[PDB]
Amino acid sequence: EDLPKAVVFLEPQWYRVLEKDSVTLKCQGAYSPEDQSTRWFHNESLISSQTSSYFIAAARVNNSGEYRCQTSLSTLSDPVQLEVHIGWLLLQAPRWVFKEEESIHLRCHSWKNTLLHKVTYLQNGKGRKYFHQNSDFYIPKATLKDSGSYFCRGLIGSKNVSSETVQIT
Amino acid sequence: GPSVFLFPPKPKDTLMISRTPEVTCVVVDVSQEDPDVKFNWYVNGAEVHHAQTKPRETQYNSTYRVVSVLTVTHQDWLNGKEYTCKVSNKALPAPIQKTISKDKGQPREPQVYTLPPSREELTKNQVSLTCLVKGFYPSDIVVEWESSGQPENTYKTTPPVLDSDGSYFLYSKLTVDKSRWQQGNVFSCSVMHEALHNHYTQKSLSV
Amino acid sequence: LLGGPSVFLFPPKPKDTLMISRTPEVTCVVVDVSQEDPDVKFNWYVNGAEVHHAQTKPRETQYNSTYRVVSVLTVTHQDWLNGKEYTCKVSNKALPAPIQKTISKDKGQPREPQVYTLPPSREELTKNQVSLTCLVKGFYPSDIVVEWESSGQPENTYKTTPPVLDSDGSYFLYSKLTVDKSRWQQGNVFSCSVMHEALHNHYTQKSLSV
Ligand SMILES: *[C@@H]1O[C@H](CO[C@@H]2O[C@@H](C)[C@@H](O)[C@@H](O)[C@@H]2O)[C@@H](O[C@@H]2O[C@H](CO)[C@@H](O[C@@H]3O[C@H](CO[C@H]4O[C@H](CO)[C@@H](O)[C@H](O)[C@@H]4O[C@@H]4O[C@H](CO)[C@@H](O)[C@H](O)[C@H]4NC(C)=O)[C@@H](O)[C@H](O[C@H]4O[C@H](CO)[C@@H](O)[C@H](O)[C@@H]4O[C@@H]4O[C@H](CO)[C@@H](O)[C@H](O)[C@H]4NC(C)=O)[C@@H]3O)[C@H](O)[C@H]2NC(C)=O)[C@H](O)[C@H]1NC(C)=O
Ligand SMILES: *[C@@H]1O[C@H](CO[C@@H]2O[C@@H](C)[C@@H](O)[C@@H](O)[C@@H]2O)[C@@H](O[C@@H]2O[C@H](CO)[C@@H](O[C@@H]3O[C@H](CO[C@H]4O[C@H](CO)[C@@H](O)[C@H](O)[C@@H]4O[C@@H]4O[C@H](CO)[C@@H](O)[C@H](O)[C@H]4NC(C)=O)[C@@H](O)[C@H](O[C@H]4O[C@H](CO)[C@@H](O)[C@H](O)[C@@H]4O[C@@H]4O[C@H](CO)[C@@H](O)[C@H](O)[C@H]4NC(C)=O)[C@@H]3O)[C@H](O)[C@H]2NC(C)=O)[C@H](O)[C@H]1NC(C)=O
Ligand SMILES: *[C@@H]1O[C@H](CO)[C@@H](O)[C@H](O)[C@H]1NC(C)=O
Ligand SMILES: *[C@@H]1O[C@H](CO)[C@@H](O)[C@H](O)[C@H]1NC(C)=O
């Protein structure tokens, strides 16, 4: 316990991201007091970009794992995990640790921002809130058995497509 | 937007007069907000409010399933009056509409035959009657079996198939105990359709 | 247009799969392919396998502007209806996932489909045309083949019913061959041939007459 520990913030607020989305990482806590420094850490390694942000325009599999950031100070940022799954739809989330109560904000993410029709989110096989076009599912206050598997199904033009299990307890 | 699937009245219901038939119009896939939809049914073009509806049945997808009835008079649906469901919803920018009538054209009487159990299929456990309906159209037919005077249990029906000369046929099978058939009982294959001795006939069989 | 293309994979037809020496197919249609030159590239498996069993047949388009592609697979006999799985593993630039359907399946309760044919029915004798009937029951592998012969020519104007689920869970079906009154009262021999998975050398016929 020495300097204030920097940490890692995401762009956007999702970590399970697909095979050709844009993602941008950035760092706080730190900041080279005059000449912005970075030293990003990928899987416990190093990258040359020198920008206080970090681009990944064409994210693909090899861009998953653990990322960290250490500017001039920044102690050593505790790790952040980044996931990429191949496919069509996904259930993008900010957190996966919801005991008793916090905020829940889920996105049934498409692919190449191509729109969806008749998307629904699911509570362990059961439906909860269906919308016609694409949109996000928000809930404040937990329901003590959302503790379970969530995913979403949608119809792209006509092809009917599903996503993958995400159990949040 | 939401989708509607205009179902037709059950044949048996519109054949004869025992149960008043209905032309069900179902609107599925509508959300918890922007539900509330009205129906301007058209029977060739005259609205008339007398079109009762079912409650907001919820389905395992939050999706409200609004249903609606329209009691069509027994004597009309056979003339072919084109019945029209019209739904308008905030989710649908434009109203959608579906109209359906008599399976159009002109019919044909389906004189029916009752083929007996084949000879070799008797020296075995239970045996099978057959009732062959042939040469008709459209597919608004119903086949039932009767014994003595009460409808029989163990029977299945083949779906209609398109014959060579633009007509349908089916083979109604009835399994009966060899003991209950060989000794001798009376079994009648009855059929209802829109082109017979005023909607009905039946053909018996024994030995 | 577009929206992501699709795949379809069907089994072979029953006559080709059962009877020996009739090359059984297996096809993969890829419908709704178009405009921006998305290409082919297939690869089959049985649970680990190899190509060499296809080569596409050009680009049917006709009407809705979608470069339609299909390719085959020459299957064995003592192989299929025996366990193997089959996958097509399609891929394409516009589809962001090498997806593919599987097949095989329809399994279980095969047994003697002892076939029972019938004569015309009394009143039928008046009209110029009477129909012979052939019922099959006692078979569960969902599909089956049924044909007719009269001494020895494919009578090509019968009609056959589609199978349905009987009581005990063994499918049953019917067939109807229409002949003029004169040909049935002549005394010709008619045979209702049936082929299914569970028969001696896979065949039966119940020659019928008066
Ligand atoms: C939310 O959940 C509900 C329900 O959930 C599920 O419901 C069923 C299906 C089970 O799987 C349950 O386990 C499960 O919980 C979803 O609502 C469903 O949505 C689908 C749409 O994909 C509808 O499918 C349609 O079905 C009709 C036939 O409907 C009969 O059969 C159904 C399945 O067997 C049965 O469930 C129905 O009750 C119905 O049964 C008849 O019902 C009527 C009255 O309702 C009754 O009088 C009869 O007695 C009764 N008879 C029997 C034997 O049951 C079918 O017609 C539809 O086909 C149309 O569309 C196809 C695709 O385009 C096409 O291939 C067809 O040809 C046909 O197309 C139309 O055809 C003619 C001209 O050819 C014409 O009308 C049109 O021009 C043409 N095109 C169009 C677009 O109409 C289709 O297969 C389900 O019925 C429906 N279930 C309901 C309402 O209960 C809902 O989708 C879910 N939401 C989400 C987001 O997932
Ligand atoms: C643009 O191009 C063409 C336009 O052609 C059009 O064809 C029809 C629709 C008419 O409108 C024409 O006027 C017009 O020209 C479109 O290409 C077609 O697209 C349709 C659907 O959009 C496909 O339909 C599928 O057909 C399969 C079965 O396919 C056989 O039968 C067809 C007719 O029944 C026949 O046309 C096909 O050629 C094919 O026939 C086989 O052909 C091969 C080739 O040589 C031959 O070797 C075989 O012997 C022969 N066999 C037979 C029996 O004929 C059908 O299975 C599909 O149904 C699936 O989806 C339904 C809804 O999801 C579902 O109810 C079905 O059960 C099935 O779904 C799957 O079912 C099982 C479980 O039940 C399981 O696998 C899955 O869980 C389940 N779901 C899925 C997703 O798999 C469907 O009906 C045509 O095949 C296709 N190609 C043609 C016609 O050549 C094209 O779509 C157009 N584009 C657009 C955007 O519209
Ligand atoms: C980062 O870690 C992931 C998951 O362990 C791995 O697949 C990937 O290859 C790693 N990146 C590099 C550049 O090795
Ligand atoms: C489409 O997805 C839903 C579940 O996600 C299911 O009802 C339906 O069977 C699916 N269709 C296919 C072809 O898998």
Residue numbers in the entry:
A (entry chain C): 3 to 171
B (entry chain A): 237 to 443
C (entry chain B): 234 to 443
What does the paper say about this structure?
In these mechanisms, the effectiveness of inactivation depends upon Fc gamma receptors (FcγRs) expressed at the surface of effector cells and the interaction of the extracellular domain of the FcγR with the Fc portion of the antibody bound to its cognate epitope. In contrast to humans, macaques only have one low affinity FcγRIII receptor, CD16, which shares a polymorphism at position 158 with human FcγRIIIa with Ile158 and Val158 variants. Similar to human low affinity FcγR receptors, the macaque FcγRIII receptor consists of two immunoglobulin-like domains packed against one another at a roughly 80-90 degree angle in a comma- or apostrophe-like shape. The Mm FcγRIII forms an asymmetric complex with macaque IgG1 Fc with the Fc binding near the bend in the comma-shaped receptor; the majority of the receptor’s contact residues to the Fc reside on the C-terminal second immunoglobulin-like (d2) domain closer to the cell membrane.
The first utilized the Ile158 variant expressed in a GnT1- cell line after deglycosylation with EndoHf to trim glycans back to a single Asn-linked N-acetylglucosamine (GlcNAc) residue at glycosylation sites: Asn45, Asn64, and Asn162. The model was refined to an R/Rfree of 0.182/0.218. Both the Mm FcγRIII Ile158 and Val158 receptor variants in complex with Mm IgG1 Fc crystallized in monoclinic space group C2 with similar cell dimensions. In both complexes, Fc monomers bind using only their CH2 domains. The average total BSA of the complex formed by FcγRIII(Val158) is higher by 334 Å2 than the FcγRIII(Ile158) complex (an average total BSA of 1,832 Å2 and 1,498 Å2 for the Mm FcγRIII(Val158)-Fc(IgG1) and Mm FcγRIII(Ile158)-Fc(IgG1) complexes, respectively, Table S2 ). The BSA differences are the result of the decreased number of contact residues between FcγRIII(Ile158) and the Fc, which include direct protein-protein interactions, glycan-protein interactions, and glycan-glycan interactions. The glycan-glycan interaction is primarily to the Fc of monomer A in the first complex of the asymmetric unit for both variants with closer contacts observed for the FcγRIII(Val158) variant and to the glycan on the Fc of monomer B for the second complex in the asymmetric unit of the Val158 structure; the glycan-glycan interaction is absent in the second complex in the asymmetric unit of the Ile158 structure where the glycan on Asn162 is disordered. The direct receptor glycan-Fc glycan cross talk is much weaker in the interface of FcγRIII(Ile158)-Fc complex and it is absent from one of the two copies of the complex in the asymmetric unit of the crystal. The glycans on FcγRIII(Ile158) were removed by EndoHf, leaving only a GlcNAc on unmutated glycosylation sites (Asn45, Asn64, and Asn162), while FcγRIII(Val158) had a Man5 N-glycan at corresponding positions in its sequence.
